[PDB]
């Protein structure tokens, strides 16, 4: 049984012709005091020719805009060390440590979507004096710790039994480990912003950290120790699918400071030119 799906293409509006005009219709004079954005197509101000316009606003929809993978965390962990807490990587989940996808997601106040998560794990042999060994392929475990579960204390913990937490074993040399994630939230939309506190006495922690608690991730080398040290770096890539977004906001201007807060330093609105009348002369023999 085959089903035919209908997909309509949304072109942009053509240019209707026009001629001279001498009337009391002023399509130009308006009043911005009303919070209303003038709809003056060129055919209202000048004489235009009929132009069938085939262009499309497809690559600017929200799904085409956001559904592209982007890195959101990089972390390193060693096969052997003398710290036992550097033998595995760990981090709380948020899209907020890399400025690119942060700023991208933060043109909207509430974003509701599924995701496609990918991991790029790349090991290197640590620089030393006595290199040279035959180590077999490394395999890695990526465990997701929801908020509440027990978190590991070493790479030989019991928690890595991953009885109910989902976790991925991947043996280096194959295609990256990818999986898909539903809308795992308790609100009705991930709230990028939040003007409020956690405690009802109007104090506590301010803003985003209050709302979103999505747990942690813990990555480790399953193999075991290593004759000579090696260090692996894991990068995590988020790609939002089935994207819905609400209440847009002006794009960020000032540079980000930390992943907790929206604190900033004041910056200029834009960069300078010589005068207010300055247009450079570029037609010159």
């Amino acid at each position: 049984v085959v089903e035919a799906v209908e997909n309509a293409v949304a072109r942009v509006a053509d240019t209707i012709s026009s001629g001279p005009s001498n009337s009391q219709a002023v399509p130009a004079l308006t009043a911005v005091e009303t919070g209303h954005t003038s709809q003056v197509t060129p055919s209202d101000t000048i004489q235009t020719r009929h132009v069938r316009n085939y262009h499309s606003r497809s690559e600017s929809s929200i799904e085409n805009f956001l559904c592209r993978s982007a890195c959101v965390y990089m972390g390193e962990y060693h096969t052997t060390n003398t710290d036992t807490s550097k033998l595995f990587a760990s981090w709380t989940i948020n899209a907020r440590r890399m400025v690119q996808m942060r700023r991208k997601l933060e043109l909207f106040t509430y974003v509701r979507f599924d995701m496609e998560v990918t991991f790029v794990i790349t090991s290197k042999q640590d620089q030393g004096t006595q290199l040279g060994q035959d180590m077999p392929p490394l395999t890695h475990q990526i465990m997701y710790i929801p908020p509440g579960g027990p978190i590991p204390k070493s790479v030989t913990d019991y928690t890595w039994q991953t009885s109910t937490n989902p976790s991925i074993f991947w043996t280096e040399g194959n295609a990256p480990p990818r999986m898909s994630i539903p809308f795992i939230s308790i609100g009705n939309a991930y709230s990028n912003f939040y003007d409020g506190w956690s405690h009802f006495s109007q104090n506590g922690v301010y803003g985003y950290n209050t709302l979103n608690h999505m747990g942690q991730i813990y990555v480790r080398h399953v193999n075991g120790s290593s004759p000579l040290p090696m260090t692996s770096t894991v990068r995590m890539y988020f790609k939002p699918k089935h994207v819905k977004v609400w209440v847009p906001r002006p794009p960020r201007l000032c540079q980000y400071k930390n992943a907790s807060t929206v604190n900033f330093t004041p910056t200029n609105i834009t960069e300078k030119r010589q005068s207010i009348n300055y247009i450079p002369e570029t037609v010159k023999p």
Binding site: V2, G35, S180, H242
Partner: protein
């Protein structure tokens, strides 16, 4: 066998592709890159009374 044959993205001036879903969860599907809808008057013209583009904005 539970398929759906939709249309590809071609420009204007053998175009049908086939989709089958394999997983038991809609959070495993592809992305909906072929929905193009708009309603700018929500942000562009959010006013109680209409304004007709050829009458004075006041008066």
């Amino acid at each position: 066998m539970g398929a759906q044959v939709s249309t590809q993205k071609t420009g204007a001036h053998i175009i049908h592709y086939t989709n089958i879903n394999y997983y038991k969860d809609a959070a495993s599907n592809s992305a909906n890159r072929q929905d193009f809808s708009q309603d700018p008057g929500k942000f562009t013209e959010p006013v109680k009374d209409i304004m007709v583009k050829s009458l004075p904005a006041l008066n």
